Design a protein around this ligand. Structure first.
Ligand SMILES: [NH3+]CCc1cccnc1
Lengths: 346, 13
């Protein structure tokens, strides 16, 4: 068992070295691969502060895609702009089985557009709120995919910075696809932007400290807790109350949590960065070798050989049954170009 | 008692 795991370690190193070579080629040579009237717009699948994600159908091929539309006017704040450029450049350069695939991107007088593969199974968020909580084996299957995805991203010096169930789509085989790279960033050491979602912020973000990829491992602790409990560990009506709970250094667990699960979570939800799993000498291996993951075949997960806990129902291509409904708003393109210079690189 | 619906991320706050 010991020598089997060591060889497994060298093989991870070999994989990550090749993956970095592939990434850098695309990172250095990143535009304008389609236009808006190539697609019929079908239905809004999600909405946020700066725009929306729509199901669209490519007129020529009939293929279905998820199109993220950002209103250039709404993207007005300094870090809102920089973050939009991070998202496009990162998504065009990465390649991993649990990351959504960007197909096209382009811009017009009014909007920016990113067209991605359509993942019809819905958000983990919906499924979790409907059933209440996932059993520990079910949660562990999803957690393992996030562990591998962060091992890949962090090896490329990428921090993700917005892990939560709303951003995890379930595909036709029951596996995860991470989307929304709007907060992802290439970071060789520390970074300083105060950003993310309140319930999932690490203490060092809240305290205005320069921070690193360990914030993603904290957020993994929040996600695993929420998957297994049905609610996150720092839970309050207003963001300021959430922040006080996060910095306190206290977490309480449901009585149905296994002791192995609580042990893992105490080491992920660790305020002391010299002690937080994922941030120590042995890096991600302290997580992958934890007892709660003892039954996890990491290679089998990567190769998608493990039977998923459930498969969402699908009625055909373009089926939107696994998504919630949103108010529809007309997509209007102005006669005058807006913010041409701020988004030159896009 | 906490937030049960979808949660918006904050870009600078
Ligand atoms: N927060 C997830 C938004 C979304 C929905 C459907 C497809 N891609 C993204």
């Amino acid at each position: 068992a010991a020598a089997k795991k060591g060889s497994e370690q060298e093989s991870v190193k070999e994989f990550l070295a090749k993956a970095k070579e592939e990434f850098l080629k695309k990172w250095e040579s990143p535009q304008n691969t389609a236009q808006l009237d190539h697609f019929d717009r079908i239905k809004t699948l999600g909405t946020g502060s700066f725009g929306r994600v729509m199901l669209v159908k490519h007129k020529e091929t009939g293929n279905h895609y998820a199109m993220k539309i950002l209103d250039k006017q709404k993207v007005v704040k300094l870090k809102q702009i920089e973050h939009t450029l991070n998202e496009k450049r990162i998504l065009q350069a990465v390649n991993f089985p649990f990351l959504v695939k960007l197909e096209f991107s382009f811009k017009d007088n009014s909007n920016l557009y990113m067209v991605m593969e359509y993942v019809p199974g819905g958000e983990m968020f919906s499924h979790l709120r409907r059933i209440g909580r996932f059993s520990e084996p079910h949660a562990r299957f999803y957690a393992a995919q996030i562990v591998l995805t962060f091992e890949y991203l962090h090896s490329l010096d990428l921090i993700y910075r917005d892990l939560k169930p709303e951003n995890l789509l379930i595909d036709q085989q029951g596996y995860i696809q991470v989307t929304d790279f709007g907060f992802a960033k290439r970071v060789k050491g520390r970074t300083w932007t105060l950003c993310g979602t309140p319930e999932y912020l690490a203490p060092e973000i809240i305290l205005s400290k320069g921070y690193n990829k360990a914030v993603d491992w904290w957020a993994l602790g929040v996600l695993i807790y929420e998957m297994a409990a049905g609610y996150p560990p720092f839970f309050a009506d207003q963001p300021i109350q959430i922040y006080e709970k996060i910095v306190s250094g206290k977490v309480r667990f449901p009585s149905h949590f296994s002791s192995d699960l609580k042990d893992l979570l105490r080491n992920l939800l660790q305020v002391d960065l010299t002690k937080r799993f994922g941030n120590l000498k042995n890096g991600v291996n302290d997580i992958k070798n934890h007892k709660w993951f003892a039954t996890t075949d990491w290679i089998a997960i990567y190769q998608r050989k493990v039977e998923a806990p459930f498969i969402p129902k699908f009625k055909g291509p373009g089926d939107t049954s696994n998504f919630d409904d949103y108010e529809e708003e007309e997509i209007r393109v102005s006669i005058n170009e807006k913010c041409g210079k701020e988004f030159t690189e896009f | 008692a906490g937030r049960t619906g979808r949660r918006q991320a904050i870009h600078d706050i």
